[PDB]
Amino acid sequence: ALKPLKTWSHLAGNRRRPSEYEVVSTNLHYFTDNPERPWELDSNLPMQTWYKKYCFDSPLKHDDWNAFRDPDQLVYRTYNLLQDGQESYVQGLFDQLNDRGHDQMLTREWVETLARFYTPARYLFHALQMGSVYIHQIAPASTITNCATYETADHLRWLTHTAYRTRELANCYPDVGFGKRERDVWENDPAWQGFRELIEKALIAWDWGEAFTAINLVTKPAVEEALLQQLGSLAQSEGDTLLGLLAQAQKRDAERHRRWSSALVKMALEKEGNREVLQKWVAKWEPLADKAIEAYCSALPDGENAIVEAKSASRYVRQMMGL
Amino acid sequence: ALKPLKTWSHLAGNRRRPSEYEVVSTNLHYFTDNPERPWELDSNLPMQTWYKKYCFDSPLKHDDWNAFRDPDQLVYRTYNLLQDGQESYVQGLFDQLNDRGHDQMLTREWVETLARFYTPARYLFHALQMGSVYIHQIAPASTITNCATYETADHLRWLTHTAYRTRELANCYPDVGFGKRERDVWENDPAWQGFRELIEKALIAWDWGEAFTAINLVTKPAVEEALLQQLGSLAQSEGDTLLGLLAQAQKRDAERHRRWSSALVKMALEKEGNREVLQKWVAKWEPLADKAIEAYCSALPDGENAIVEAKSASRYVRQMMGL
Amino acid sequence: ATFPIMSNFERDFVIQLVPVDTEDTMDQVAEKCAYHSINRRVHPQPEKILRVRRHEDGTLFPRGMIVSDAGLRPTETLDIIFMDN
Amino acid sequence: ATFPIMSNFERDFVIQLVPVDTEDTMDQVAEKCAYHSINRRVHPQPEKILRVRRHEDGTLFPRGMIVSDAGLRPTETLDIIFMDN
Amino acid sequence: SMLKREDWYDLTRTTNWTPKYVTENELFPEEMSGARGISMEAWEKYDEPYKITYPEYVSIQREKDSGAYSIKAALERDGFVDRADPGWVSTMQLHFGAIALEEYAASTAEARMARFAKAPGNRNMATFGMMDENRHGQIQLYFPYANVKRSRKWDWAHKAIHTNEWAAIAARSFWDDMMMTRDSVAVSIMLTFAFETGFSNMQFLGLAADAAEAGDHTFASLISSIQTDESRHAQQGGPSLKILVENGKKDEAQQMVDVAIWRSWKLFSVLTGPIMDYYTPLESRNQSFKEFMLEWIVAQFERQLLDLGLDKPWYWDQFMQDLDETHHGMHLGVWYWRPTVWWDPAAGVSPEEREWLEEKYPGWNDTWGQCWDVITDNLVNGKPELTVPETLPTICNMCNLPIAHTPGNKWNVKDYQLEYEGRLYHFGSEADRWCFQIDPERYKNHTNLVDRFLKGEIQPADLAGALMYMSLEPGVMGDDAHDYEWVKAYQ
Amino acid sequence: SMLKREDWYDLTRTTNWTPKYVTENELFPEEMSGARGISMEAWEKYDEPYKITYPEYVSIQREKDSGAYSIKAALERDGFVDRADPGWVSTMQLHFGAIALEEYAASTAEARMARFAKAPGNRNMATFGMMDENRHGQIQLYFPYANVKRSRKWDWAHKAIHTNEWAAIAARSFWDDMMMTRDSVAVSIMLTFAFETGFSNMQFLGLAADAAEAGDHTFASLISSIQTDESRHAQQGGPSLKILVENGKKDEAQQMVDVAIWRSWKLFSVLTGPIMDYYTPLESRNQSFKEFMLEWIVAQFERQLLDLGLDKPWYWDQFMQDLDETHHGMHLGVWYWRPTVWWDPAAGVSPEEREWLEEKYPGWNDTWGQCWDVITDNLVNGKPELTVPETLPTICNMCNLPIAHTPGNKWNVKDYQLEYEGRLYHFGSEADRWCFQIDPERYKNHTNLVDRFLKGEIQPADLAGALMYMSLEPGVMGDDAHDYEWVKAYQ
Ligand SMILES: [Fe+3]
Ligand SMILES: [Fe+3]
Ligand SMILES: [Fe+3]
Ligand SMILES: [Fe+3]
Ligand SMILES: [O-]
Ligand SMILES: [O-]
């Protein structure tokens, strides 16, 4: 008879006793057991085809993607411990600056800037949420999928801050059209069309590795530097302390997404040929990001410096992984 | 035989099913069962005498102090739910403004003001902690005692913020003597001697009702208006956003202490003669508070307006209870 | 000569895989089926005779017909019923 | 004439309150004590005689002495012991 | 101060825009979205009746895991599991193997609606759903993990769905059909409406009640906590159904419901039915599996279907009838073929048990009772070898479960065969066959275990070979749950 | 970023200043502070070895109540209490009545050090202590409250310490002496060092173990959670003791320790000793009350006392000896006078129990066993009336407990009498008498129940009168825990 094991069969002989993280996150996708028939149905079903094409046939290759490990090691339970903490802080900010009358103290000029540069981000943030939720459902291993799950909730987290602050702003400045105008700004403002195009196009890159690169390595770095870093330093110097803080709080999420993307890239580099693959995908998309950052930041105050700073900080992210 | 009851014997026939609050807070002091011998020992013991004199013989009188009810209805369990929340927010502030380099951005002049007007509050706040912890141990009913318990932890909460920010300030401005100099400022600065005297004297008012009045109705209103309201609005306009926020966060605690003091006063007014008793105690102490506020605020910028504002806001607290 | 069929034995609860031979008589089919049902979940009926009918349409095969001539589809489902003729 | 004493009955585990009379003999003290110890937690010893000694210093009272003359402090503790004289 | 939720909620799901740089069909491919010719503007009427927002979620859910993980740690050392009724231990081992990884797969299913649904409210609710099944997957792994040193069967909580063991194939067969391989709107109908709202919600309620009756509070708490998450994403299919009916599609909507309810029912008849009526000790039996189905599952569907403008499925009466039968079959199948599963099946046919079975199901002893008479006599008479099988049973090509039914004095076992493109398929019911016929390209080249056996895919091509093929060895292969203790009642 | 705690902690307790507007003796009255001629500067060396700060506290403690309240709610419906061994139910009823309000009183005791101690570290640690006993008081009320509809005895969790029932007087007698009526330094020695560190810490550990062995996880969790709070304020007396010894006061320090250990021991012998050795079912008995005392309480004091520069108390050997005896007495007292308490006492003298008692305590049957022989014969022979009392027992004037000891073939019951200012006092031991003699003004005019009875304070002046005086009526008055079931062993 087979003996009871110390740990899951797929983890035995690891020398170190498996962590909670390893216990609940590893080797969970079963569609990768039969690359020829992922799903327990006819093998010509459109979904069969979708997974064969966009997961299995990706040029980004590894013999064992299940070896991937979040460096932050997040599980649901600790994701909600972290994020409840960070939300007590942000909801705290909202409560107490309202109480203070913070929105009343902003200048008309700044209010106008918010309507143009800040509010419509609900579309860009929802579209990252879609972006990251797609990586989830197409990635080759559960630990990859998980990082993308928690990142998708952050993206919703940001959409949610923006939706909230948008009422408060409408409540305080009823004539501006906060909440009504954002769609036409997103759709028609030249400052947004760089990003809108970047994201619409990256949203239809189905290959898992090209989705990871286009969303996590290229679009995100560019959205983050432009909307969190640049608009936030601006916010602070124009007297918006709430958005300077809010934005820095969301950049905590972004730095975590960066740490796992970097770990993934690091793992992909163990295999000959992947750097070239990733570098190629970056070159295809970088020009759309450059355009995004140009069209957005150039319309800001001190526009050209914001472009130089955002360009180089977002490139830096990729440089640090060895790309 | 006696039948099992629906609730505690001392709560039966209340019509409404007793709350958690009523279940864990009411009718718990036993020293009031024998006003002639509070403690199960010889009746001439000094502590026997202390309680007879300072609890039982207080001029502030009621037939049933056990009827008192916190309007906030706090119990340990919900005290720590509230305060963990408010601490995620404040510790959040500390983390993120450090990260921002907030202490580096303050002007030398403002740093000098902090060393003089802000840091030494660790003494004043510790002395309120002593003040409130004394009300705890001498008050005539557990629900009174409890309010004073949770208020004493707030007082420690504030001492703790100040102790913390004091290292950070020392770390950032090593030449100023933050952390080393506060005792001599507390002890010798004319700006502090108004308060120092108020608090040293109120700290030896042993009668429970006179302790409640001197600490909760008089000293606190005056410390709060001067150190939270006035120094905080000042902080904000001088570019200290951390202290403007910190101070407003602590004023949440103060508003809660006010709500229970007001409820106590309201209850004391059911009895003929108590208003006069309370009014008399206020008149004895108000002049020391006036002095406290004068010596502190006059040394601030725009000094005289701070004195008029602090005086009248603290009087307002007492006016609202009907005093 | 080995040929799969699905045996729906009378008074059992389950249809089952039963490999027979193409040279077998119905009688010999029935005997290879009973092995998997009689004294497992069905009580012998020795007063009776085991007959073979095609499940889809109720056709009754003579005892002596061989599998070879019955026109069965591999895996075809067969009723194995108790009769006296 | 009712006078409190504390009865430390031999072979019991507990000293107890026993109201006696000032006119009682030691014998009658002992009998009012046994009531609270014999056949409750102590086995009778009918071969024996119940005697009264003062607990503090071991003085033995004659059977016939009355409480009145014994010089007891109210509540004084008394040994009630089994003897043959 | 804070806003009331009511005041700003709609802005969280005002997230639709008119793409320009790519086309609508390119951003929302029909095969993933299933928008069905209905416009973005019409999908925007989608309105989830239970609303929630990010800060509420992370807060409320930290509270749930805190309690559940705390209960677990407090009771860990008492090791209730070492003295639980073995019908119960078995119940848990079956639950964990069949469910843990399917729950985790359900997050991808939710991710399907999160990216691909044209209703913005659907897309956000699905994000919380995604979070939810990440929770159900993770915790339903953390829990049985406490028990790995007790038996290798607990390893199956992770390993099951990775195997070709028949129950696992049946499981994947159901889930992949329902949620992994359908468009977004279809997932919302077939999974969240038909299965989650239709079955698994009331089931998890009952299973927590049972666990508590068994004196297993760790597990009662586990299940009961999962269940409080259900309706928040379970709600998703209703609004979809409304939109489809209000526009030109009552039939498409209907047909998905018919399909998902039948496929769910079948899985439920092998996984829950046997448990209720046979593993649960007699005196813990609150009600029968047929009763449970009538009170808690069936009247509810009728309500829902009526309220949405839909009808009762064509098979409804047959469904009604099969409540007296299917699961008895499924149980007998599982017990008889017990070395083929990874838990120990409970026979549950002692004298007392059998008169209960006859109260709840008149006719039981003069149908199901017969097979069990023979099993019993054999174990009394020292012939245990006649109570284990020497062949495979015929598997349904739709539900991947044995084709069984009423035996004994009212024999009624039927096979609903179909020849399609030169191949003979087998079906356990008229409905299973009909599922295939309406959409044969979806099922056509799949092969069940029997197919595989017959095709030479299992080697060696005998019973010990199929054991290896199914990843089963001594240690995990099931035997009688109570080690045949109930046989003594007959000598 | 955040500072490390190490870096700023000292600033939290740098809170001493030189008063000017009032005098040091006025702000710190000696009768409350007990500074003892030792200067502010010397009190400032006080250094608590376990450090904590406000945000850590409120965070960690929200986590503890979450779990404990969650365990409670999860197990509430199973109502374990209705099928627990009645020796256990009794154990809980005694615990709640004797402890709930004394725990809450302990917060005032902590408040004593918070205001009045000259050591700033002491003043802050006491604030957390204050918080802690607010928690212990509150939760130890919330818990038994679940059980009010089951019996009026549960009402005693609130009512006990409000009554003149003898156990309650004994309780107040101890606590008021230890913590409610002493100066700050003295509270820190006598309560946190001698009692909390000395007894209640290891006791609560053992009691949680026992609760778990009884299959009562609600209560095991309750107790086990309280216990994790203990050392954080229990630590307080050690630094005080150091300061007193390092300056001119080894004797004052010594004498308080001697007093607090003896007074604690006595309470512990009626409240814990009987439980371990008689209410706990035989087969749950991990070890004897004497063994427990030797392993977990006594070697620890020796360690501590040696490490602080102090000696073993004068009575130590006597203490050693009395471990064989005192609690057997206390148990017999409680059982015999059972209508005078608010729980049902467990006899615990079945044949099996008695041979256990004889293994753990050689001589038991030929001393303690005798009284129990007579009790038993009487219940066998239909004379139950001879097993309940017709008088009061003599109460010790220090510990307010009956004066009892070794009966039977090695009779040794002594009374340590004292005449002082025209009044005769009674004492249960040499130590109880000595406690009074060193500080007679503290105890002099107190009266125990017997005193009161004899003075005409109890009216009517008979047994039914003392029942009323003690607030006891049928419903709460104790009887034999197992309703005399163990008598059948003898017929
Ligand atoms: Fe789920
Ligand atoms: Fe679900
Ligand atoms: Fe405590
Ligand atoms: Fe304590
Ligand atoms: O769920
Ligand atoms: O404690």
CSV table of N, CA and C in Angstrom, one decimal, chain E residues 182-263:
chain,number,residue,atom,x,y,z
E,182,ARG,N,-17.4,27.8,-22.9
E,182,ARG,CA,-18.5,28.6,-23.4
E,182,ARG,C,-18.3,30.1,-23.4
E,183,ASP,N,-19.0,30.8,-24.3
E,183,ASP,CA,-19.0,32.3,-24.2
E,183,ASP,C,-19.6,32.8,-23.0
E,184,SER,N,-19.3,34.1,-22.8
E,184,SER,CA,-19.5,34.8,-21.5
E,184,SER,C,-20.9,34.7,-21.1
E,185,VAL,N,-21.8,35.0,-22.0
E,185,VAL,CA,-23.3,35.1,-21.7
E,185,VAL,C,-23.6,33.7,-21.3
E,186,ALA,N,-23.2,32.8,-22.1
E,186,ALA,CA,-23.5,31.4,-21.8
E,186,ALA,C,-22.9,30.9,-20.5
E,187,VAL,N,-21.7,31.4,-20.1
E,187,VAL,CA,-21.2,31.0,-18.8
E,187,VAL,C,-22.2,31.5,-17.7
E,188,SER,N,-22.5,32.8,-17.9
E,188,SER,CA,-23.4,33.4,-16.9
E,188,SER,C,-24.7,32.7,-16.8
E,189,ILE,N,-25.4,32.2,-17.9
E,189,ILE,CA,-26.5,31.3,-17.8
E,189,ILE,C,-26.2,30.0,-17.1
E,190,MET,N,-25.3,29.3,-17.8
E,190,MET,CA,-25.2,27.8,-17.5
E,190,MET,C,-24.5,27.5,-16.1
E,191,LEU,N,-23.6,28.4,-15.7
E,191,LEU,CA,-22.9,28.2,-14.5
E,191,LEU,C,-23.6,28.9,-13.3
E,192,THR,N,-23.6,30.2,-13.4
E,192,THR,CA,-24.1,31.0,-12.2
E,192,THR,C,-25.5,30.8,-12.0
E,193,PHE,N,-26.3,30.8,-13.1
E,193,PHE,CA,-27.8,30.6,-12.9
E,193,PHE,C,-28.2,29.2,-12.6
E,194,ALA,N,-27.9,28.3,-13.6
E,194,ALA,CA,-28.4,26.9,-13.5
E,194,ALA,C,-27.7,26.1,-12.4
E,195,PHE,N,-26.4,26.1,-12.4
E,195,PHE,CA,-25.7,25.4,-11.4
E,195,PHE,C,-25.6,26.0,-10.0
E,196,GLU,N,-25.1,27.3,-9.9
E,196,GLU,CA,-24.8,27.8,-8.6
E,196,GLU,C,-26.0,28.2,-7.8
E,197,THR,N,-26.9,29.0,-8.5
E,197,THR,CA,-28.2,29.4,-8.0
E,197,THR,C,-29.1,28.2,-7.9
E,198,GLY,N,-29.1,27.3,-8.9
E,198,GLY,CA,-29.9,26.1,-9.0
E,198,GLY,C,-29.6,25.0,-8.0
E,199,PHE,N,-28.3,24.8,-7.8
E,199,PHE,CA,-28.0,23.6,-7.0
E,199,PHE,C,-27.0,23.9,-5.9
E,200,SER,N,-25.9,24.5,-6.2
E,200,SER,CA,-24.8,24.4,-5.3
E,200,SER,C,-25.0,25.2,-4.0
E,201,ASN,N,-25.9,26.2,-4.2
E,201,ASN,CA,-26.3,27.1,-3.1
E,201,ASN,C,-27.0,26.4,-1.9
E,202,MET,N,-28.0,25.6,-2.3
E,202,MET,CA,-28.8,25.0,-1.3
E,202,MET,C,-28.1,23.7,-0.9
E,203,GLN,N,-27.3,23.1,-1.8
E,203,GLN,CA,-26.5,22.0,-1.4
E,203,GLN,C,-25.5,22.3,-0.3
E,204,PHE,N,-24.8,23.4,-0.4
E,204,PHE,CA,-23.7,23.7,0.5
E,204,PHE,C,-24.3,24.0,1.9
E,205,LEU,N,-25.5,24.6,1.9
E,205,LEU,CA,-26.3,24.9,3.1
E,205,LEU,C,-26.5,23.6,3.8
E,206,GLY,N,-27.0,22.6,3.1
E,206,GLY,CA,-27.4,21.3,3.6
E,206,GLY,C,-26.1,20.5,4.1
E,207,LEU,N,-25.1,20.6,3.4
E,207,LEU,CA,-23.8,19.9,3.7
E,207,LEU,C,-23.2,20.5,5.0
E,208,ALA,N,-23.3,21.8,5.2
E,208,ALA,CA,-22.9,22.4,6.5
E,208,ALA,C,-23.7,21.9,7.7
E,209,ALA,N,-25.0,21.8,7.4
E,209,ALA,CA,-25.9,21.3,8.5
E,209,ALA,C,-25.5,19.9,8.8
E,210,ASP,N,-25.3,19.0,7.8
E,210,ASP,CA,-24.8,17.6,8.0
E,210,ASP,C,-23.5,17.5,8.7
E,211,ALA,N,-22.6,18.4,8.4
E,211,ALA,CA,-21.3,18.4,9.0
E,211,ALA,C,-21.4,18.6,10.5
E,212,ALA,N,-22.4,19.5,10.8
E,212,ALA,CA,-22.5,19.9,12.2
E,212,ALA,C,-23.2,18.8,12.9
E,213,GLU,N,-24.2,18.2,12.4
E,213,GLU,CA,-24.8,17.0,12.9
E,213,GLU,C,-23.8,15.9,13.1
E,214,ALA,N,-22.7,15.8,12.3
E,214,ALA,CA,-21.7,14.8,12.5
E,214,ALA,C,-20.7,15.2,13.6
E,215,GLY,N,-20.8,16.4,14.1
E,215,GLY,CA,-19.8,16.9,15.1
E,215,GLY,C,-18.5,17.3,14.5
E,216,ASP,N,-18.5,17.6,13.2
E,216,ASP,CA,-17.3,18.2,12.5
E,216,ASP,C,-17.5,19.7,12.2
E,217,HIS,N,-17.1,20.5,13.2
E,217,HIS,CA,-17.3,21.9,13.2
E,217,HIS,C,-16.2,22.6,12.3
E,218,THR,N,-15.1,22.0,12.1
E,218,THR,CA,-14.1,22.6,11.2
E,218,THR,C,-14.7,22.7,9.8
E,219,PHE,N,-15.3,21.6,9.4
E,219,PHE,CA,-15.7,21.5,8.1
E,219,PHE,C,-17.0,22.2,7.9
E,220,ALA,N,-17.9,22.2,9.0
E,220,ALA,CA,-19.2,22.9,9.0
E,220,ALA,C,-19.0,24.4,8.8
E,221,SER,N,-17.9,24.9,9.4
E,221,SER,CA,-17.5,26.3,9.3
E,221,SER,C,-17.0,26.6,8.0
E,222,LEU,N,-16.1,25.7,7.4
E,222,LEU,CA,-15.6,25.8,6.1
E,222,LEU,C,-16.7,26.0,5.1
E,223,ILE,N,-17.6,25.1,5.1
E,223,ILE,CA,-18.6,25.0,4.0
E,223,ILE,C,-19.6,26.2,4.1
E,224,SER,N,-19.9,26.5,5.4
E,224,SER,CA,-20.8,27.5,5.7
E,224,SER,C,-20.3,28.9,5.3
E,225,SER,N,-19.0,29.0,5.4
E,225,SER,CA,-18.4,30.3,5.0
E,225,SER,C,-18.3,30.5,3.5
E,226,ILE,N,-18.0,29.4,2.7
E,226,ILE,CA,-17.9,29.4,1.3
E,226,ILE,C,-19.3,29.8,0.9
E,227,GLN,N,-20.3,29.3,1.5
E,227,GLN,CA,-21.7,29.5,1.0
E,227,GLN,C,-22.1,30.9,1.0
E,228,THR,N,-21.6,31.7,2.0
E,228,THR,CA,-22.0,33.1,2.1
E,228,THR,C,-21.5,34.0,1.0
E,229,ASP,N,-20.5,33.5,0.3
E,229,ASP,CA,-19.9,34.1,-0.9
E,229,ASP,C,-20.8,33.8,-2.2
E,230,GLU,N,-21.5,32.8,-2.1
E,230,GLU,CA,-22.2,32.3,-3.4
E,230,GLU,C,-23.1,33.3,-4.1
E,231,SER,N,-24.1,33.8,-3.4
E,231,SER,CA,-25.0,34.6,-4.2
E,231,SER,C,-24.5,35.8,-4.9
E,232,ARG,N,-23.3,36.3,-4.4
E,232,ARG,CA,-22.7,37.6,-4.9
E,232,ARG,C,-22.3,37.5,-6.3
E,233,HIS,N,-21.9,36.2,-6.7
E,233,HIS,CA,-21.6,36.0,-8.1
E,233,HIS,C,-22.6,35.1,-8.8
E,234,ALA,N,-23.2,34.2,-8.0
E,234,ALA,CA,-24.3,33.4,-8.4
E,234,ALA,C,-25.4,34.2,-9.2
E,235,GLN,N,-25.6,35.4,-8.8
E,235,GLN,CA,-26.6,36.3,-9.3
E,235,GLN,C,-26.5,36.6,-10.8
E,236,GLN,N,-25.3,36.2,-11.4
E,236,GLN,CA,-25.0,36.8,-12.6
E,236,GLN,C,-25.8,36.4,-13.8
E,237,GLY,N,-26.4,35.2,-13.8
E,237,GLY,CA,-27.0,34.7,-15.0
E,237,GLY,C,-28.4,35.3,-15.2
E,238,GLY,N,-29.1,35.7,-14.1
E,238,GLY,CA,-30.4,36.2,-14.2
E,238,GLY,C,-30.6,37.4,-15.1
E,239,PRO,N,-29.8,38.5,-14.9
E,239,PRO,CA,-29.9,39.6,-15.8
E,239,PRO,C,-29.6,39.3,-17.3
E,240,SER,N,-28.6,38.4,-17.5
E,240,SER,CA,-28.4,37.9,-18.9
E,240,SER,C,-29.6,37.3,-19.4
E,241,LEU,N,-30.3,36.4,-18.7
E,241,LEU,CA,-31.5,35.7,-19.1
E,241,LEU,C,-32.6,36.8,-19.5
E,242,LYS,N,-32.7,37.8,-18.7
E,242,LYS,CA,-33.7,38.9,-19.0
E,242,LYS,C,-33.4,39.5,-20.3
E,243,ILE,N,-32.2,40.0,-20.5
E,243,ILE,CA,-31.8,40.6,-21.7
E,243,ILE,C,-32.1,39.8,-23.0
E,244,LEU,N,-31.8,38.5,-22.9
E,244,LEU,CA,-31.9,37.6,-24.0
E,244,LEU,C,-33.4,37.4,-24.3
E,245,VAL,N,-34.2,37.2,-23.3
E,245,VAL,CA,-35.7,37.1,-23.5
E,245,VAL,C,-36.4,38.4,-24.0
E,246,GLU,N,-36.0,39.5,-23.4
E,246,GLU,CA,-36.5,40.8,-23.8
E,246,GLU,C,-36.1,41.2,-25.2
E,247,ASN,N,-35.1,40.5,-25.8
E,247,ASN,CA,-34.7,40.7,-27.1
E,247,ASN,C,-35.0,39.4,-27.8
E,248,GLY,N,-34.5,39.1,-28.9
E,248,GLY,CA,-35.1,38.1,-29.7
E,248,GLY,C,-34.8,36.7,-29.4
E,249,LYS,N,-34.4,36.4,-28.2
E,249,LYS,CA,-33.8,35.1,-27.9
E,249,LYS,C,-34.4,34.1,-26.7
E,250,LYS,N,-35.7,34.1,-26.5
E,250,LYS,CA,-36.2,33.1,-25.6
E,250,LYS,C,-35.7,31.7,-25.8
E,251,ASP,N,-35.6,31.3,-27.1
E,251,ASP,CA,-35.3,29.9,-27.4
E,251,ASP,C,-33.8,29.5,-27.1
E,252,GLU,N,-32.9,30.4,-27.5
E,252,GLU,CA,-31.4,30.2,-27.2
E,252,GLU,C,-31.2,30.1,-25.7
E,253,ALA,N,-31.8,31.1,-25.0
E,253,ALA,CA,-31.8,31.1,-23.6
E,253,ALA,C,-32.3,29.8,-23.0
E,254,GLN,N,-33.5,29.5,-23.4
E,254,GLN,CA,-34.2,28.2,-23.0
E,254,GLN,C,-33.3,27.0,-23.1
E,255,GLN,N,-32.7,26.9,-24.3
E,255,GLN,CA,-32.0,25.7,-24.6
E,255,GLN,C,-30.8,25.5,-23.7
E,256,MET,N,-30.0,26.5,-23.5
E,256,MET,CA,-28.9,26.5,-22.5
E,256,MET,C,-29.3,26.1,-21.1
E,257,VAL,N,-30.5,26.7,-20.6
E,257,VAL,CA,-31.0,26.3,-19.3
E,257,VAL,C,-31.3,24.7,-19.3
E,258,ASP,N,-32.0,24.3,-20.3
E,258,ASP,CA,-32.3,22.8,-20.4
E,258,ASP,C,-31.1,22.0,-20.3
E,259,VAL,N,-30.1,22.3,-21.1
E,259,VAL,CA,-28.8,21.7,-21.1
E,259,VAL,C,-28.1,21.8,-19.7
E,260,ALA,N,-28.0,23.0,-19.1
E,260,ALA,CA,-27.2,23.1,-17.8
E,260,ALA,C,-27.9,22.4,-16.7
E,261,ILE,N,-29.3,22.4,-16.7
E,261,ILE,CA,-29.9,21.8,-15.5
E,261,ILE,C,-29.8,20.2,-15.6
E,262,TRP,N,-29.9,19.7,-16.8
E,262,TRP,CA,-29.8,18.2,-16.9
E,262,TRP,C,-28.4,17.8,-16.6
E,263,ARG,N,-27.4,18.4,-17.1
E,263,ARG,CA,-26.0,18.1,-16.8
E,263,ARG,C,-25.6,18.2,-15.4
